[PDB]
Design a protein around this nucleic acid. Structure first.
Ligand SMILES: [Zn+2]
Length: 252
DNA sequence: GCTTCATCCTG
DNA sequence: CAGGAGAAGCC
């Protein structure tokens, strides 16, 4: 899962317990046990995202950080209820009625103010595609800036240092959107393809966020399926040490 | 890249 | 049941 799916969950989280006094806190990691009693009686002032990184802030200026990587997922149940699964619960934040549960995730750390600009991941990430103030123009400048100008999209479109919230499926989809493969570079592009790439880089991820579960897959998990644009045979290969879906007669 | 820690589902 | 599907670590 990526930014789109991470913001949708964050919101579900805010919709369930934000502003609500926590009647209980629980963590799997012993190291975090110390913040439990500490958090009881406090409340989430706001849950923030910055890519696939999840920051759940508290009234006492503490912030719960977490990355779902590829297995962590958030649940939202009614207090006292715990649907079953083999997943390993990692965090419990409960209030009178609503409760949220985090399973699987392994990157769960508690930050005080300072680490919010010091954490290993937080320090690294670039603008958020879901971030409003982030405009195509800015994103367009960044593509041409000297820090990314000479980098292939196959790898760049995955690098959080460039843009937070983009993952693989968004990787294949965005490039298919503008008819490109992962072997190009911002510098090897005309003004019409950069501006295109630019928007797709923000619009698509958003469209996914706003509509995924309208948004549908156009090349992800579609090997053997017919390209909807030209109709060529979409092949599955490996790009960036991960699966890459694309159209042979649609991407150059 | 490449190699590795780290969960969970098909397959 | 081995593979396989977001990042940091080391050349
Ligand atoms: Zn095509």
């Amino acid at each position: 899962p990526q930014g789109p799916e991470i913001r949708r969950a964050a919101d579900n989280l805010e919709a369930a317990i934000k502003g609500k006094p926590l009647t209980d806190v629980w963590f799997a990691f012993p190291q975090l046990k110390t913040y439990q009693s500490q958090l009881i009686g406090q409340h989430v002032t706001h849950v923030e995202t910055r890519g696939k990184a999840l920051l759940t802030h508290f009234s006492n200026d503490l912030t719960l950080y977490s990355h779902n990587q590829l297995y962590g997922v958030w649940r939202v149940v009614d207090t006292g209820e715990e649907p079953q699964t083999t997943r390993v619960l990692r965090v419990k934040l409960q209030t009178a009625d609503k409760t949220i549960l985090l399973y699987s995730a392994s990157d769960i750390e508690m930050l005080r103010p300072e680490q919010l600009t010091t954490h290993p991941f937080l320090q690294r990430v670039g603008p958020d595609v879901l971030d409003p103030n982030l405009t195509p123009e800015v994103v367009k400048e960044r593509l041409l800036s000297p820090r990314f100008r000479n980098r292939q999209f196959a790898g760049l479109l995955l690098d959080q240092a460039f843009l937070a919230g983009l993952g693989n499926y968004l990787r294949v989809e965005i490039l298919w959107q503008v008819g490109l493969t992962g072997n190009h570079k911002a510098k090897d592009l005309n003004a019409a393809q950069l501006d295109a790439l630019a928007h797709a880089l923000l619009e698509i991820p958003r469209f996914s966020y706003a509509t995924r579960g309208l948004f549908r897959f156009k090349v992800f998990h579609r090997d053997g399926e017919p390209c909807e644009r030209c109709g060529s045979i979409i092949e599955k290969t490996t790009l960036s040490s991960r699966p890459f879906y694309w159209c042979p007669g649609c991407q150059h």
